[model samples]
Target chain A: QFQKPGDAIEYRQSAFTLIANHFGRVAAMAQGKAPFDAKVAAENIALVSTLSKLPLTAFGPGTDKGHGTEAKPAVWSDAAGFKAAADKFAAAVDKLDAAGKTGDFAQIKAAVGETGGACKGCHDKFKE
Target chain B: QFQKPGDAIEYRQSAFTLIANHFGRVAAMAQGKAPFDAKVAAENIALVSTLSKLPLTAFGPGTDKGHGTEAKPAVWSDAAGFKAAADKFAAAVDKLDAAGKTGDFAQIKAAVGETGGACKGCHDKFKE
Candidate 1:
């Protein structure tokens, strides 16, 4: 479990990069690049979509370091804040996945922007 | 040349990640991770240290999109704010590189934190 704010910041930073790289790959695919296959896109989407829940996965119950590698205990302690951030992030990823499926560049751009916004919003408050 | 705030935000975000990843590699090496080789450290440090000048590179004179991949014009337009942020970031990285050379983990960590602080400070003011 994360005892310091720096740990939480590091985890969130990793998550942000994962999501950004996923979007970059999907964006590249939409632009007719064959390097980023559909399987890669799907897998990245699933990883980000599922890992979206990590921000709220607390350090409680049977878990020692929460559900993942570097989740903070403050997530559970400040349930409302964490849940709100997670919900916002999940919604953005949902939009991104939909845009990817449709191959809508404009929608994908908007979705990526929204996702970035959500990440920054949460980091501004929760990350140190 | 960027005519939109979103463009500036995008450039800054990329820069933020570049610096973060550079610090991450440095931190990994400080922890005795061999994958992040010395050459990688030197290259990343150089990339970040040079790129730190980009926020103030401007969209004026012989350049079309400024220097590098995705710099914005607002950096020069709002010279005071951009320079202040850039200076702070450069100072932080200088400290980080010094720590890396000396293999000082504590100093490296503090320098990374200071660099991040500079990034956030600039983002809060200049990034949209």
Candidate 2:
């Protein structure tokens, strides 16, 4: 089995796109802009659960040297910090999915902020 | 989980987007424009297999009547025909995934032509 750095980037980018799109709709519900549908929230959050496990594996060695990547050098230079941020994001998304499954908008709203913070913490340091 | 018709469309559309973006890079390889990476081919095609099972469920009845859907009324009106087309696409995607796993470019190429035909057949009859 052979994999290219660009392929890793492309795969992760696609995974991120799915995560973003799926969560965006859930976010609308949490924000009270969209009517809350428990089924929709539950299903998409389950999808979030699936995608949350992906991108990290794609950040393999040689990925940084490739042409289509947004990872900052800090991801490798400050590896511990990056891993912490990534771990935080993963935990946050897991909480969001758990809250969504409860079908309680209040719980989902609270978790949404936490999830956003975790993502921002990582992006602020590691993403270009 | 509570779901809206809009939610169904959004979820499925998100699925479609994921499927398209993942396969776009694979398409490049199939066309010989991108260097073939066996692992990339296997992984992305496996992702495709996962997604191939998604969009159909998203095409539940009310989803077609709402905003942001490409599904033609024929999907519901000519349900049997639509189902056949969907089955064709599903089988074709499976073949492609199966071929990708074999690490055989020749097999993948043959499957690619069949996969494209199945998609075209569905798009021509069922998509708007």
Candidate 3:
């Protein structure tokens, strides 16, 4: 979809940036650093679910070296692993999406932990 | 919700970046620069709809001076005008979202024109 490798890099970077920001909002609430408003948490989680679908496609071949990408070479060298990690994150977000819909603090908090761990897992292995 | 003005600035910038990218994907198809695929166009427009709701909240007071914001002083100085422009954009996106659901190229093309105009309207008045 991107016209150039740099464009792809920029696209994924922008997606990840937004995902982290929105997810952080919910995570803060879960961690008790911010007020827990179920409506607001649901809203942010919905945004995160939309954003989480974006970045993986932007990691196509030749996108590994543009826009100062933090993605390590392992993303290309171990593409299967990279995809698995992405799937893990997506599954976590799916659960979070369901939790958000229910507007239950306990469910949302547990989902947040799983989703955040998924994020950390991918960053640890794939991101530089 | 933001801890600092810079955080809000970053949040809005990230949102606008994603919005522009996804909108550009569908716009390219509408403009004949790319192959027209109904599924792809609809997917992108859905993402644009989700992202379109984000940046306005980040444009709160004290956010204009941080994170290399390109927003003009008028975003705060003429806050009412800024809000009107934002509302126009949202309304345009609503139409685009509906057109996308129908998978009708003609409707999508017309909606793209209106939506792009809204973007330009806001940028012309509010962005530097």
Candidate 4:
């Protein structure tokens, strides 16, 4: 539970930031921008899998207005769509995790595409 | 793999922020400030275990001067000591993860104490 709206905002922002950072690590390899190391990609993707669930929990009623939150009002106003987007992200992450475990580059690349699309699904509609 | 020192600072700070947030959730239950739910405690501790390894990687040579970094100069000046502190924290987190898996409150409480101490051990000397 957050002590203040700002605390919740910080909590969610922190989670999302870490998620993006870790995901980027794996994505770079998937796109061949960085050398692909199965061990490294798997480690980073595992972190993304775990981090995917945290931010949504902190987006409570009062969190929309604090800590320079970029979350759109529709996050709460159109809660169903937000939840749907979140679910899509979660599913994509699950697929990515599976791909990461296999150490297959093609699987990881496809999954990364899906996961990034899922991230954009929320950002396009629910974030500033 | 960080392109800039500021990026590394943000990466490390974001990891630490999430680590503290997740650790606080289990710590609150361990401290009796919140009712203990074994499932919730285990889940939060699992996240902490994953997050514990991230910040150390980001505290590289040039990261001490950017994005309002609170890392003290000794992080780079006395690199060995900072590394030892990090290893100690990692060991403590491993124990915490083991305790969490058991879902025993007494074990979790003791592990939390050790883990929190490990965190402070680094923060006291390495952080501003």
Top-TM-score structure, candidate number: 4
**Where is model 3 chain B poorest over a 10-residue stretch in terms of lDDT?**
B9-18
Task: Residues B87-111, candidate 3: write the lDDT tens digits.
Answer: 9999999999999999999999999
- What's the ranking of the predictions by DockQ, best on top? 4, 3, 2, 1
DockQ of 2: 0.15
lDDT tens digits, residue span B63-110, model 1: 324223343445557777767877887788788667557554566566
- Best-to-worst order by lDDT is 3, 4, 2, 1
Question: In order, what lDDT does every prediction score?
Answer: 0.57, 0.80, 0.91, 0.90
Off by over 4 Å in 4: none
Model 2, A1-128: lDDT tens per residue?
Answer: 12567766766766776677777778888888899998998887887787888778778777886756788988888989988998898889878988977898888888888987887888898888
Candidate 1 DockQ category? incorrect
* Best DockQ among the predictions, by candidate number: 4
Runs in model 2 with CA error above 4 Å? Answer: A1-50, A53-87, A91-128
User: Native contacts recovered, in order, as a fraction for each?
Assistant: 0.00, 0.15, 0.62, 0.62
Model 3, residue B116: distance off in Å is 1.0
TM-score of chain B of each: 0.57, 0.94, 0.97, 0.97
lDDT string, candidate 2, B20-101, tens digits: 6667667778889789988998887877777778777777777777755788888899999988998899889988988988
Docking class of 3: medium
Off by over 4 Å in 1: A1-128, B1-17, B27-43, B59-78
